[PDB]
Amino acid sequence: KSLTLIVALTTSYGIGRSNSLPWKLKKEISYFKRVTSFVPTFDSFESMNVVLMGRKTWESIPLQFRPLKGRINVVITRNIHSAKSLDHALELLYRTYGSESSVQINRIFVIGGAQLYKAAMDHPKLDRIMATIIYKDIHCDVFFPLKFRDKEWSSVWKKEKHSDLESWVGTKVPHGKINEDGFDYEFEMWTRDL
Numbered sequence: 001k002s003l004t005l006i007v008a009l010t011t012s013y014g015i016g017r018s019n020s021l022p023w024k025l026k027k028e029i030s031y032f033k034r035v036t037s038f039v040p041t042f043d044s045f046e047s048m049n050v051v052l053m054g055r056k057t058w059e060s061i062p063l064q065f066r067p068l069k070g071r072i073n074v075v076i077t078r079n080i081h082s083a084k085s086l087d088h089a090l091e092l093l094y095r096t097y098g099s100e101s102s103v104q105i106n107r108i109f110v111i112g113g114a115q116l117y118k119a120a121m122d123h124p125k126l127d128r129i130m131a132t133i134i135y136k137d138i139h140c141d142v143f144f145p146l147k148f149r150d151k152e153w154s155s156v157w158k159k160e161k162h163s164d165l166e167s168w169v170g171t172k173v174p175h176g177k178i179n180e181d182g183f184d185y186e187f188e189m190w191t192r193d194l
């Protein structure tokens, strides 16, 4: 099964500031909730998505939102499911939600932070980035680890047609720039060959 990473980052790959998001974007939060908690209509009795996150990200989420509803949550920590790496998480999942289980696994998302992102980009099953691009240079102190939208990575990572994005996330997604509270930002989907 493939992994998908989902992130919102600035044109300078900023993702974070002071253990939180440096923007308060209500429509971006909804896209995130929607993409990660969406499952092919016919499977939706059985099927559930998984959200894999680092311990720091786990701790950053306002309590009212933990665990993230309607998704299987696994926190990765070297020391709610906990596993010690991405692959341990995958073994826990297959073992726990085995054909003998009534909950089934649809898509598995890596939702942050930088350290987990870095491991997910190293993972041979990761082939898709759902990137929210924020066209401002907001000060940040945590950064996305690999510059997948830059020249150096452009033979590996390709940005897909907007209609391919909508086909994947299964609904109309705004095209182009959305303005909210001082920010322009745009939804993208990038893939690479496995």
Ligand SMILES: NC(=O)C1=CN([C@@H]2O[C@H](COP(=O)(O)OP(=O)(O)OC[C@H]3O[C@@H](n4cnc5c(N)ncnc54)[C@H](OP(=O)(O)O)[C@@H]3O)[C@@H](O)[C@H]2O)C=CC1
Binding pocket: 006, 007, 008, 009, 014, 015, 016, 017, 018, 019, 020, 021, 053, 054, 055, 056, 057, 058, 060, 076, 077, 078, 079, 084, 085, 086, 111, 112, 113, 114, 115, 116, 117, 119, 142
């Ligand atoms: N813009 C966006 O979309 C997002 C931004 N963020 C931002 O990211 C920041 C958090 O990033 P970061 O500090 O790197 O934190 P992470 O959330 O990646 O948490 C780091 C910790 O998780 C565990 N961990 C991470 N990767 C692995 C791995 N490969 N194997 C084993 N354990 C691992 C470790 O926990 P342990 O120390 O317990 O062993 C590590 O100390 C904040 O600024 C947050 O707001 C977060 C999510 C999304």
Ligand SMILES: COc1ccc(C#CCCCC(=O)O)c(Cc2cnc3nc(N)nc(N)c3c2C)c1
Binding pocket: 006, 007, 008, 019, 020, 021, 028, 029, 032, 033, 056, 057, 060, 061, 062, 065, 068, 069, 110, 111, 112, 131, 132
């Ligand atoms: C750590 O700093 C954070 C502070 C607050 C929140 C929150 C919240 C409400 C979500 C409710 C729900 O989903 O039910 C988040 C999670 C978040 C947000 N947008 C995100 N946006 C994108 N494009 N990607 C992500 N990975 C996001 C991720 C992890 C991180």
